[PDB]
Swiss-Prot record:
The TPR repeat-binding motif mediates interaction with TPR repeat-containing proteins like the co-chaperone STUB1. It is found in: Nucleus; Cytoplasm; Melanosome; Cell membrane. This is Heat shock protein HSP 90-alpha. GO terms for biological process: activation of innate immune response; cardiac muscle cell apoptotic process; cellular response to heat; cellular response to virus; chaperone-mediated autophagy; chaperone-mediated protein complex assembly; mitochondrial transport; neurofibrillary tangle assembly. One of its GO terms (cellular component) is sperm plasma membrane. It comes from Homo sapiens (Human). Residues 1-209 are annotated as: Interaction with NR3C1. GO terms for molecular function: ATP binding; ATP hydrolysis activity; ATP-dependent protein folding chaperone; CTP binding; dATP binding; disordered domain specific binding; DNA polymerase binding; enzyme-substrate adaptor activity. The lineage of its organism: Eukaryota, Metazoa, Chordata, Craniata, Vertebrata. ISGylated. It comes from the Eukaryota. The chain holds residues 16 to 224 of 732 of the full protein. Changing residue 82 to D: Abolishes ATPase activity. Changing residue 78 to A: Impaired ATP-binding. Strong interaction with HIF1A, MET, KEAP1 and RHOBTB2. Loss of interaction with HSF1 and ERBB2. Los of interaction with TSC1. Keywords: Acetylation, ATP-binding, Cell membrane, Chaperone, Cytoplasm, Host-virus interaction, Hydrolase, Membrane, Mitochondrion, Nucleotide-binding, Nucleus, Phosphoprotein, S-nitrosylation, Stress response, Ubl conjugation. Molecular chaperone that promotes the maturation, structural maintenance and proper regulation of specific target proteins involved for instance in cell cycle control and signal transduction. Undergoes a functional cycle that is linked to its ATPase activity which is essential for its chaperone activity. This cycle probably induces conformational changes in the client proteins, thereby causing their activation. Interacts dynamically with various co-chaperones that modulate its substrate recognition, ATPase cycle and chaperone function. (Microbial infection) Seems to interfere with N.meningitidis NadA-mediated invasion of human cells. Decreasing HSP90 levels increases adhesion and entry of E.coli expressing NadA into human Chang cells; increasing its levels leads to decreased adhesion and invasion.
Length: 209
């Protein structure tokens, strides 16, 4: 059972901007996703200080980067606080409203796309390299859900039937045909060292066999 929702007008405008403009410095998407994962891990770790039972769904706090040349996907996995159904559908997009408007004002005040993180909307930089993004997420207070969008103004949310995650979020990037360099080991390493050398959680690169 799948529900289809329309993106808020300003978010749909940002994604169409991100997809259609010519911007060569596409590697910043990984920094933004890793920084988002760091925030999610900070939140569960902070909450667990007053409630250790919040870690019953997993004590490990880490980030895994998993390229797959066969499927042409790059997957970013964190064991952070995860996302509820209301987060996926309403609350997060409501908070991103002001940032998207301001980010688009800044895009005419000099700023470029690489500053997307300073407006709290860095996640949508995934569409610099991805034609489709799938988000599997599990929050302690909700079921496992699957969010998906190929942009174009709509996204879907459904209960996920696949492998249970425990807790956290999995961002699956279905890369565009010309963006397969982000499946390469030495390319991901160079990006992580340059942009995320100061993340307070272990970032593990899964190399393919
Ligand atoms: O970082 C930018 C703000 N977006 C966040 S925090 N999360 C996104 C995940 C996909 C579905 C929920 C809402 C959008």
């Amino acid at each position: 059972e799948v529900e289809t929702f329309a993106f808020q007008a300003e978010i749909a405008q940002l994604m169409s901007l991100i997809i259609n403009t010519f911007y060569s410095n596409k590697e910043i998407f990984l920094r933004e996703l890793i920084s988002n994962s760091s925030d999610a891990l900070d939140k569960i770790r902070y909450e667990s200080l007053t409630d250790p039972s919040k870690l019953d769904s997993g004590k490990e706090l880490h980030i895994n980067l998993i390229p797959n040349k066969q499927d042409r996907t790059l997957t970013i996995v964190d064991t952070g606080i995860g996302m509820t159904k209301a987060d996926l559908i309403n609350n997060l997009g409501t908070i991103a409203k002001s940032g998207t408007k301001a980010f688009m004002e800044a895009l005419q005040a000099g700023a470029d796309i690489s500053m997307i993180g300073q407006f709290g909307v860095g996640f949508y930089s995934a569409y610099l390299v991805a034609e489709k993004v799938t988000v599997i997420t599990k929050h302690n207070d909700d079921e496992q859900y699957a969010w998906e969008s190929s942009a174009g103004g709509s996204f879907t949310v459904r209960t996920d039937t696949g492998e249970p995650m425990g807790r956290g979020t999995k961002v699956i990037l279905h890369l565009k045909e010309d963006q397969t360099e982000y499946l390469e080991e030495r390319r991901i390493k160079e990006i992580v060292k340059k942009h995320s050398q100061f993340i307070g959680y272990p970032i593990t690169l899964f190399v393919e066999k």
